[PDB]
Amino acid sequence: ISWNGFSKKSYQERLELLKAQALLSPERQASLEKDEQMSVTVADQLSENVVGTFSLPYSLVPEVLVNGQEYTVPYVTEEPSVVAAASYASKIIKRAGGFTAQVHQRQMIGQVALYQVANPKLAQEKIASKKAELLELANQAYPSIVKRGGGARDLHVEQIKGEPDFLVVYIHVDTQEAMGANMLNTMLEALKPVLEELSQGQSLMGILSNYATDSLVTASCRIAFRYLSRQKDQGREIAEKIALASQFAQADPYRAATHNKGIFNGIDAILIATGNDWRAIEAGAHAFASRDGRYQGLSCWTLDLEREELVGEMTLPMPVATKGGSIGLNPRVALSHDLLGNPSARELAQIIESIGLAQNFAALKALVSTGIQQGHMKLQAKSLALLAGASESEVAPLVERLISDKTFNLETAQRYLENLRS
Amino acid sequence: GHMKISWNGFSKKSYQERLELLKAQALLSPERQASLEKDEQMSVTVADQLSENVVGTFSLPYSLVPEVLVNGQEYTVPYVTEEPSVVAAASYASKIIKRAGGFTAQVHQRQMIGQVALYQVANPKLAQEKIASKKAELLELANQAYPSIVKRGGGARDLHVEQIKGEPDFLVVYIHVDTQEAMGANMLNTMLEALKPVLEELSQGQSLMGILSNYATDSLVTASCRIAFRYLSRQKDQGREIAEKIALASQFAQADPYRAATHNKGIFNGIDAILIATGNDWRAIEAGAHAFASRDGRYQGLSCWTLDLEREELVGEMTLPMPVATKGGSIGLNPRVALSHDLLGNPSARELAQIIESIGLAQNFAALKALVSTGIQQGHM
Ligand SMILES: CC(C)(COP(=O)([O-])OP(=O)([O-])OC[C@H]1O[C@@H](n2cnc3c(N)ncnc32)[C@H](O)[C@@H]1OP(=O)([O-])[O-])[C@@H](O)C(=O)NCCC(=O)NCCSC(=O)C[C@@](C)(O)CC(=O)[O-]
Ligand SMILES: CC(C)(COP(=O)([O-])OP(=O)([O-])OC[C@H]1O[C@@H](n2cnc3c(N)ncnc32)[C@H](O)[C@@H]1OP(=O)([O-])[O-])[C@@H](O)C(=O)NCCC(=O)NCCSC(=O)C[C@@](C)(O)CC(=O)[O-]
């Protein structure tokens, strides 16, 4: 069964189409049809001073092809056109072969800040020359069930200049599937007393870093010009303008901020659905956006003129998880993982990275062609046309006559739908 | 000050007791209090209007951060977060800072920046001089396509052109528009799209895009607190060391981007919580603020904590772009978002921006105080 015409289906028809796809078990489908929410007693366990619950929309972005595997992505967003834009971009890019994505590394970085170090140079080399014992110390409670390529893998000391000067020790630990810093804090808590003794300094803090450069993930798409425009040869011009738009985000931070914001309309939507910490992802990615000395766009769009293809690519820190937190407490988050086929943490990271590039593509394509206002008043005319009882074959001629008028309401679509039937 | 029911021991109250205490405060109307007691949620029919392909609704916790004193006015702040200890830390930090006199905050400006990128300009210098010398007609043009914002005190205020070098060269026109209580995305892009045809003619170039910018440097807001050392520790003699170590933690975030990211992440645990509660766009705030953190060439912490040794006080300060809104979006559609604005006394957009700016510094304060003293090992309650 295809997702064609899913645009124009009603809420009840969307749930029947999802049931036809057979993506959810009987229990999860029923849970979704009752619109089961996280209970107040559960929310009382996740947060403090809880006095109720707050609800947001829950949507589906279909036909997300990542590495030859197709997914139905769950979105949680309150902003109109975000889901429609990701769905439109996902369909086009699926026709172009889908996304290719990889996880370069998956390790979390912890750091211990030391200060009041008499000689940072000798302390740097003294701690460095005990790297083996320091990592052996950090690995002593995880000798084999973790020490199979996981565990504390690397350590190094660096002199960070400034006011004052800090001696920072970075530890690199294999994260596994859970969002548990229990691994990290066990290694940090034991290294702090030793690092103080080796450096003859004082420890300021031992904390995880959300600048997760040991968890980079890249996704890419390759779109033939013929897929960008129905017109003859104008798919190349749209491609040229999308590559220019990507260079603008590299040149002006005022554009980079908006460029990267559009990326995170989708990334945060799937991060919320899957119960992931979007503040950590937003921080690491936006810090990553200025790694070359200036805040620039997080994705690149270039032209392959000889193959006649538009190429998109984006690398971000994406240390997402599939266990822990609200994943096992929020029943709709568990349903979101089931919906995606229970992907691994690395597989989920490549799906999120792909929808962010898909979200970015739909924004740039609209900005450089029709504009972003046009696409905002076509979805209203569409939703108002469905509330007026229009069939699928008559939505399009009703939207053209509604969008023709400056202002239209439900009473406007109803009168026009009646003339269409007269 | 007494004669007003206090929030002491609110941590230890049960869910039903929290609603009774909130009812005793008399902050919500009979309808809003009842709406909260029924735990009224946004319906699927309403959510159907906010998003596409809606197949249900997604629920998050909804919490209260009490005793948020901003500019001598006290508030009960609503939080929507799924992360444990976030609400507890913001409540704890707000109580201490309330004892220290609360927050002082200001709004420097409240204008949105839109931009039109031009390329293929034969003479960018002459095109720059042609567009600049017609600022008056261009901004009158920008206000003629959105007349309703002019009738309420707002609209396009300033314009300027910039030559951005590179490959290729861009000629970018920035407009500064007064949005009033709205975030003004629909407003701005409507004005930009109307300027695009004219700017093409003035420059004899091609328009690439006309779009709002989330780098809202015309909407900076800073909040600050001033905490005597005696308030930093219950021992009333260890507050100096706690103060010194929080200032060191604040400078670590200025020196190491690996710390700055975590430092700024803790800020937005609270900022995003109140942005969701009030129906505001946290993606826009996250993007502009994190871009703002690298304005001096390196990604650094967004807040400053310094020592006033002669006054024996810890000083905190944070400036962020905060172009929040009180009308539009899901405001007035999500019944809990309208309840959140009522709970805060229906503050103006500028007053709301100073509450959000203050709670972000309060969140940052509680994190630094813990990392530098007990540490954040698990903190499971
Ligand atoms: C929104 C569209 C797709 C409308 O464009 P359209 O012409 O109305 O599309 P369509 O209705 O003719 O159908 C084409 C396909 O698009 C999908 N689709 C189309 N409509 C719907 C719908 N109601 N609900 C669900 N899916 C929809 C859907 O897959 C559909 O296929 P179908 O199902 O018919 O076989 C287009 O105008 C667009 O891509 N706009 C871009 C909006 C965007 O990218 N992001 C929204 C956030 S706005 C923002 O501020 C971010 C930004 C833009 O600033 C970032 C930046 O500046 O870089
Ligand atoms: C958590 C406390 C307050 C406990 O520390 P404590 O002193 O043992 O708590 P307490 O019960 O003794 O103090 C009571 C008061 O504190 C608040 N409070 C205290 N407990 C609760 C509770 N269960 N529920 C609701 N409110 C609570 C509340 O205001 C309460 O007022 P009262 O009811 O007594 O009148 C303290 O240790 C703390 O502030 N820790 C900071 C933890 C934190 O910042 N969490 C945020 C998420 S972690 C994060 O952001 C990542 C990070 C930190 O790396 C970012 C960064 O690096 O900056």
TrEMBL record, chain A:
Keyword Oxidoreductase: yes
Keywords: NAD, Oxidoreductase
EC code: 1.1.1.88
Pathway connected to this protein: Metabolic intermediate metabolism; (R)-mevalonate degradation; (S)-3-hydroxy-3-methylglutaryl-CoA from (R)-mevalonate: step 1/1
Superkingdom assignment: Bacteria
EC top class, as a word: oxidoreductase
UniProt name for this protein: 3-hydroxy-3-methylglutaryl coenzyme A reductase
Organism encoding this protein: Streptococcus pneumoniae
